[PDB]
């Protein structure tokens, strides 16, 4: 089954190379991960920390950094930005 990202998350996925408007959740997670990797946002020495600053992802989350080990805020953003 596919989900439809809402516009602010869709821009992020497109920035990471996603094409189109409909994706499986695994595909959403792949492209959102790709955004973080290709923009080198994770800390190379503490790779669960993501420093997004004021980029699209930091604006969407309302935070300049987050930890993949504490994913509640990510899951909140994903809930609000994926139409199942």
């Amino acid at each position: 089954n596919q989900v439809r990202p809402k516009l602010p998350l869709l821009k992020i996925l497109h920035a990471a190379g996603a094409q189109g408007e409909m994706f499986t959740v695994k595909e959403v997670m792949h492209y959102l991960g790709q955004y973080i990797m290709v923009k080198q946002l994770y800390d190379a020495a503490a790779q669960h920390m993501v420093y997004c600053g004021g980029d699209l992802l930091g604006e969407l989350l309302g935070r300049q950094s987050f930890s993949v080990k504490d994913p509640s805020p990510l899951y909140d953003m994903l809930r609000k930005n994926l139409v199942t």
């Binding site: 973080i36 669960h48 994913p71 899951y75 809930r79």
Partner: peptide, 12 residues
């Protein structure tokens, strides 16, 4: 542990 390995553990 790499970013990719941490990221793969997410399960929204």
């Amino acid at each position: 542990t790499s970013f990719a390995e941490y990221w793969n553990l997410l399960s929204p």
